[PDB]
Design an enzyme around this catalytic site. Structure first.
Site, PDB file in Angstrom:
ATOM      1  N   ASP A  63      41.191  47.487  35.757  1.00  0.00           N
ATOM      2  CA  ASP A  63      40.942  49.102  36.418  1.00  0.00           C
ATOM      3  C   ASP A  63      42.672  49.269  36.548  1.00  0.00           C
ATOM      4  O   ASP A  63      42.062  49.891  37.752  1.00  0.00           O
ATOM      5  CB  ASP A  63      39.432  49.536  35.883  1.00  0.00           C
ATOM      6  N   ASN A 109      51.150  37.548  32.457  1.00  0.00           N
ATOM      7  CA  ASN A 109      51.621  39.123  33.263  1.00  0.00           C
ATOM      8  C   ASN A 109      53.179  39.293  33.618  1.00  0.00           C
ATOM      9  O   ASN A 109      52.750  38.646  35.563  1.00  0.00           O
ATOM     10  CB  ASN A 109      50.264  39.680  33.495  1.00  0.00           C
ATOM     11  N   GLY A 112      54.526  44.606  36.302  1.00  0.00           N
ATOM     12  CA  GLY A 112      55.231  45.459  37.391  1.00  0.00           C
ATOM     13  C   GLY A 112      54.891  46.858  37.704  1.00  0.00           C
ATOM     14  O   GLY A 112      55.430  47.621  38.108  1.00  0.00           O
ATOM     15  N   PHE A 113      53.191  46.561  38.001  1.00  0.00           N
ATOM     16  CA  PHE A 113      52.505  48.319  38.701  1.00  0.00           C
ATOM     17  C   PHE A 113      53.246  49.344  37.712  1.00  0.00           C
ATOM     18  O   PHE A 113      53.631  50.452  38.390  1.00  0.00           O
ATOM     19  CB  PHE A 113      53.228  48.063  39.997  1.00  0.00           C
ATOM     20  N   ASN A 145      43.394  49.374  45.229  1.00  0.00           N
ATOM     21  CA  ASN A 145      44.742  48.414  46.331  1.00  0.00           C
ATOM     22  C   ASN A 145      45.803  48.704  46.062  1.00  0.00           C
ATOM     23  O   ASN A 145      46.433  49.893  44.549  1.00  0.00           O
ATOM     24  CB  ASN A 145      44.061  46.497  45.179  1.00  0.00           C
ATOM     25  N   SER A 179      51.867  40.592  44.219  1.00  0.00           N
ATOM     26  CA  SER A 179      52.320  40.376  43.535  1.00  0.00           C
ATOM     27  C   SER A 179      53.788  40.055  43.160  1.00  0.00           C
ATOM     28  O   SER A 179      54.648  39.988  43.734  1.00  0.00           O
ATOM     29  CB  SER A 179      52.636  41.824  43.079  1.00  0.00           C
ATOM     30  N   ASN A 181      55.357  40.299  40.363  1.00  0.00           N
ATOM     31  CA  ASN A 181      56.301  41.338  39.160  1.00  0.00           C
ATOM     32  C   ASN A 181      57.558  41.969  40.302  1.00  0.00           C
ATOM     33  O   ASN A 181      57.692  43.353  39.841  1.00  0.00           O
ATOM     34  CB  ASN A 181      55.419  41.491  38.488  1.00  0.00           C
ATOM     35  N   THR A 182      56.847  42.585  41.064  1.00  0.00           N
ATOM     36  CA  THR A 182      58.226  43.831  41.854  1.00  0.00           C
ATOM     37  C   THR A 182      59.286  42.857  42.792  1.00  0.00           C
ATOM     38  O   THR A 182      58.919  42.117  43.890  1.00  0.00           O
ATOM     39  CB  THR A 182      57.259  44.397  43.212  1.00  0.00           C
ATOM     40  N   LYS A 219      46.098  41.352  50.684  1.00  0.00           N
ATOM     41  CA  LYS A 219      46.148  39.530  49.245  1.00  0.00           C
ATOM     42  C   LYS A 219      46.585  38.902  48.943  1.00  0.00           C
ATOM     43  O   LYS A 219      48.160  39.435  49.085  1.00  0.00           O
ATOM     44  CB  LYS A 219      45.998  41.047  48.101  1.00  0.00           C
ATOM     45  N   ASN A 248      46.477  36.047  44.385  1.00  0.00           N
ATOM     46  CA  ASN A 248      47.076  36.478  43.286  1.00  0.00           C
ATOM     47  C   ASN A 248      47.496  35.636  42.395  1.00  0.00           C
ATOM     48  O   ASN A 248      46.840  34.105  42.483  1.00  0.00           O
ATOM     49  CB  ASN A 248      48.318  37.040  43.800  1.00  0.00           C
ATOM     50  N   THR A 249      48.202  36.082  41.319  1.00  0.00           N
ATOM     51  CA  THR A 249      48.728  34.569  40.154  1.00  0.00           C
ATOM     52  C   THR A 249      50.179  34.322  40.941  1.00  0.00           C
ATOM     53  O   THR A 249      50.021  34.397  41.994  1.00  0.00           O
ATOM     54  CB  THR A 249      49.034  35.625  38.961  1.00  0.00           C
TER      55      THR A 249
HETATM   56  C1  LIG Z   1      46.952  41.699  33.418  1.00  0.00           C
HETATM   57  C2  LIG Z   1      46.731  41.286  34.823  1.00  0.00           C
HETATM   58  C3  LIG Z   1      47.236  42.198  35.739  1.00  0.00           C
HETATM   59  C4  LIG Z   1      47.236  41.841  37.704  1.00  0.00           C
HETATM   60  N1  LIG Z   1      47.338  42.963  38.090  1.00  0.00           N
HETATM   61  C5  LIG Z   1      47.339  43.246  39.701  1.00  0.00           C
HETATM   62  C6  LIG Z   1      47.254  44.166  40.406  1.00  0.00           C
HETATM   63  O1  LIG Z   1      48.074  45.076  39.878  1.00  0.00           O
HETATM   64  N2  LIG Z   1      47.225  44.658  41.593  1.00  0.00           N
HETATM   65  C7  LIG Z   1      45.997  43.227  42.282  1.00  0.00           C
HETATM   66  O2  LIG Z   1      46.697  42.958  43.318  1.00  0.00           O
HETATM   67  N3  LIG Z   1      46.113  41.586  41.314  1.00  0.00           N
HETATM   68  C8  LIG Z   1      46.729  41.651  40.282  1.00  0.00           C
HETATM   69  N4  LIG Z   1      45.706  40.650  38.714  1.00  0.00           N
HETATM   70  C9  LIG Z   1      45.894  39.347  39.688  1.00  0.00           C
HETATM   71  C10 LIG Z   1      44.043  39.268  39.624  1.00  0.00           C
HETATM   72  O3  LIG Z   1      43.606  40.943  40.277  1.00  0.00           O
HETATM   73  C11 LIG Z   1      43.731  37.944  40.160  1.00  0.00           C
HETATM   74  O4  LIG Z   1      44.117  37.995  41.782  1.00  0.00           O
HETATM   75  C12 LIG Z   1      44.396  36.547  39.326  1.00  0.00           C
HETATM   76  O5  LIG Z   1      45.038  37.486  38.465  1.00  0.00           O
HETATM   77  C13 LIG Z   1      43.962  35.624  39.650  1.00  0.00           C
HETATM   78  O6  LIG Z   1      42.011  35.924  38.897  1.00  0.00           O
HETATM   79  P1  LIG Z   1      41.723  35.853  37.588  1.00  0.00           P
HETATM   80  O7  LIG Z   1      42.692  34.521  37.106  1.00  0.00           O
HETATM   81  O8  LIG Z   1      40.290  35.573  37.275  1.00  0.00           O
HETATM   82  O9  LIG Z   1      42.652  36.184  36.468  1.00  0.00           O
HETATM   83  C14 LIG Z   1      47.023  41.045  37.894  1.00  0.00           C
HETATM   84  C15 LIG Z   1      46.110  39.460  36.742  1.00  0.00           C
HETATM   85  C16 LIG Z   1      45.982  40.379  35.444  1.00  0.00           C
HETATM   86  C17 LIG Z   1      46.016  38.973  34.657  1.00  0.00           C
HETATM   87  O1  LIG Z   2      51.768  44.417  37.812  1.00  0.00           O
HETATM   88  C1  LIG Z   2      51.701  44.156  37.734  1.00  0.00           C
HETATM   89  O2  LIG Z   2      52.693  42.675  37.503  1.00  0.00           O
HETATM   90  C2  LIG Z   2      50.765  42.749  38.954  1.00  0.00           C
HETATM   91  C3  LIG Z   2      50.818  42.736  39.906  1.00  0.00           C
HETATM   92  C4  LIG Z   2      50.043  41.714  40.026  1.00  0.00           C
HETATM   93  O3  LIG Z   2      49.398  41.929  41.908  1.00  0.00           O
HETATM   94  N1  LIG Z   2      49.524  40.476  40.382  1.00  0.00           N
HETATM   95  C5  LIG Z   2      49.827  40.729  38.785  1.00  0.00           C
HETATM   96  O4  LIG Z   2      49.382  39.594  38.639  1.00  0.00           O
HETATM   97  N2  LIG Z   2      50.347  41.144  38.151  1.00  0.00           N
END
Ligand SMILES: Cc1cc2nc3c(=O)[nH]c(=O)nc-3n(C[C@H](O)[C@H](O)[C@H](O)COP(=O)(O)O)c2cc1C
Ligand SMILES: O=C(O)c1cc(=O)[nH]c(=O)[nH]1
Ligand SMILES: N#C/C(C(=O)Nc1ccc(-c2ccccc2)cc1)=C(/O)C1CC1
Length: 360
Positions: A63, A109, A112-113, A145, A179, A181-182, A219, A248-249
Site C-alpha cells: 500500500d 521489482n 523506483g518509488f 515508510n 531501496s 532502485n534509486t 530499514k 529490504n530486497t
Molecule cells: C513489489 C514490491 C515493492 C516494494 N516497495 C517497497 C517500498 O516502497 N519501500 C520499502 O521499504 N520496501 C519495499 N519493498 C520491500 C518489502 O517491504 C520487503 O522488505 C521485501 O519485499 C522482502 O519481504 P517479502 O519477501 O515478504 O516480500 C517492496 C517489495 C516489493 C515486492
Molecule cells: O520503489 C521501489 O522500487 C522499491 C523500494 C524499496 O525500498 N524496495 C524495493 O524493492 N522496491
C-alpha cells in the site's frame, strides 16, 4: 480458504494480468473491504511504545500511497506499514517494472518509488486519523515508510520533510535507506552519511508534540558487508534509534534461481531472500546486544518462517511477496502455524521466543 486461493484464484488472476495490474486491482479490492481467526494472547507483543495484537504486519510497498489501511487490518495483519512516500509526487521507473518468478516463489521489482507524494498521503491519513488512534490503542499500530525523490539534491532534507508531514500521523516512521532502485540511496547506509542523516531525522522527530511523536526505525538491505553492519549497529546505539527493519530486497541472485526473468534488474523478494534476511536479523541482534527492536522481513510464508526470524531476534515480522502467491489466507495461516509452534516448542508467547536462538 487456503487451497482455493493457492490453487485456483491466484494462478487464474496471474494468467490474466501483468503483475503491476494485478497489484493495482488487489489494492482496490482491499481498500473496498472485498475479502472475507481470533488472535490468541500468546501472539500479543509489546514493543516500540505500543501493543501489537499479533506480530505479523504487511511490509512496505503493497500500500504505497495509504489507500487500503483499513482493509489490511481486516485481512488479519497486527500492524500496517505504508509507503515508501517521497516528498513530491513522482512517477517511478518506466514499465514493465515488476516480474514474477513463480518457480522460485519470488518477485523482482524496480518500481523506483512511484509515489503520490507527502501531501496526498497526509490528507488521506488525516481523513481517518481518529479512527487510527483507536485502532492503535486497541493493538493495531500504523507505520509510515519515507523515501526520497529521484532528483532531490539533499537527501536529509527529503527525510526531514517526511518526518514533519507524516510523523504526526504515524506510530513509527521508517527511514528507508535500502531501496535498490534509486541511484546512490544505499550509500546512505555508510557510517558518516547515516549518522548525519539520522541525527537530523531524530532532531525533527523530537520537535514534534508528545502525542504525535513516532518511534523511528531504519530499514536496511540484505547485501551489506560485515563492516557496514558493524557501522550501522554502532550508529544506531550511539543515536538511540528506536529499531531496525531487516531487510529490504536483494540485488544478489542466489545460485539456483529457475525463473525465466531471474536476470531482470531490480530487488529480489520472496523465498530466495528468506535465509539471507534471517541471517542479517541474527547478526544485527547480536551486534546491538538484543537491545534494539527488529522487525524481520523477507520470504516469510509460514509459521516456521516467522518463528525462525523471531528466534534470530525479531520482535515482529512482515510479509509481502507470499501474499502475491497465496493471497489473503496466508495471513491467518502464518498466525495459526506460529501459535502451534510456540506451544510445541514450550514458549509462553511470542515474547519469550524473541532472540531465543542466542540463549542456547
Ligand atoms: C513489489 C514490491 C515493492 C516494494 N516497495 C517497497 C517500498 O516502497 N519501500 C520499502 O521499504 N520496501 C519495499 N519493498 C520491500 C518489502 O517491504 C520487503 O522488505 C521485501 O519485499 C522482502 O519481504 P517479502 O519477501 O515478504 O516480500 C517492496 C517489495 C516489493 C515486492
Ligand atoms: O520503489 C521501489 O522500487 C522499491 C523500494 C524499496 O525500498 N524496495 C524495493 O524493492 N522496491
Ligand atoms: N503479481 C502480483 C501481485 C499480486 O497478485 N498481488 C495481490 C495481492 C493480494 C490479492 C488479493 C486477492 C483477494 C483479495 C485481496 C487481495 C491479489 C493480488 C502484487 O501485489 C505485487 C506487485 C507484484
Amino acid at each position: 480458504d487456503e487451497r482455493f486461493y493457492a490453487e485456483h484464484l491466484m494462478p487464474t488472476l496471474q494468467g490474466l494480468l501483468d503483475p503491476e495490474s494485478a497489484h493495482r486491482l488487489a489494492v482496490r479490492f482491499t481498500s473496498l473491504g472485498l475479502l472475507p481467526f481470533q488472535d490468541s494472547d500468546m501472539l500479543e507483543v509489546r514493543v516500540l511504545g505500543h501493543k501489537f495484537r499479533n506480530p505479523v504486519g504487511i511490509a512496505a510497498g503493497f500500500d504505497k500511497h495509504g489507500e487500503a489501511v483499513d482493509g489490511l487490518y481486516k485481512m488479519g495483519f497486527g500492524f500496517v506499514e505504508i509507503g515508501s512516500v517521497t516528498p513530491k509526487p513522482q512517477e517511478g521507473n518506466p514499465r514493465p517494472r515488476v516480474f514474477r518468478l513463480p518457480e522460485d516463489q519470488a518477485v523482482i521489482n524496480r518500481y523506483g518509488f512511484n509515489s503520490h507524494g507527502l501531501s496526498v498521503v497526509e490528507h488521506r491519513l488525516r481523513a481517518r486519523q481518529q479512527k487510527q488512534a483507536k485502532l492503535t490503542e486497541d493493538g493495531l499500530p500504523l507505520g509510515v515508510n519515507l523515501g526520497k525523490n529521484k532528483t532531490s539534491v539533499d537527501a536529509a532534507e527529503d527525510y526531514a520533510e517526511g518526518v514533519r508531514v507524516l510523523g504526526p500521523l504515524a506510530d513509527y516512521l521508517v527511514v528507508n535507506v535500502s531501496s535498490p532502485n534509486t541511484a546512490g540511496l544505499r550509500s546512505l547506509q555508510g557510517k558518516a552519511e547515516l549518522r548525519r542523516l539520522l541525527t537530523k531525522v531524530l532532531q525533527e522527530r523530537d520537535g514534534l508534540r508528545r502525542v504525535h511523536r513516532p518511534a523511528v526505525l531504519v530499514k536496511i538491505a540484505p547485501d551489506l558487508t560485515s563492516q557496514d553492519k558493524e557501522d550501522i549497529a554502532s550508529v544506531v546505539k550511539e543515536l538511540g534509534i528506536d529499531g531496525l527493519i531487516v531487510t529490504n530486497t536483494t540485488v544478489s541472485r542466489p545460485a539456483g534461481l529457475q525463473g525465466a526473468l531471474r536476470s531482470e534488474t531490480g530487488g529480489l523478494s520472496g523465498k530466495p531472500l528468506r535465509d539471507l534476511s534471517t541471517q542479517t536479523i541474527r547478526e544485527m541482534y547480536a551486534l546491538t546486544q538484543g537491545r534494539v527492536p527488529i522487525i524481520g522481513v523477507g520470504g516469510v510464508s509460514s509459521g516456521q518462517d516467522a518463528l525462525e526470524k523471531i528466534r534470530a531476534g525479531a520482535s515482529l515480522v512482515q510479509l509481502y511477496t507470499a501474499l502475491t502467491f497465496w493471497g489473503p489466507p496466508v495471513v491467518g495461516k502464518v498466525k495459526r502455524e506460529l501459535e502451534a509452534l510456540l506451544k510445541e516448542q514450550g514458549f509462553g508467547g511470542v515474547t519469550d521466543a524473541i532472540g531465543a536462538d542466542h540463549r542456547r
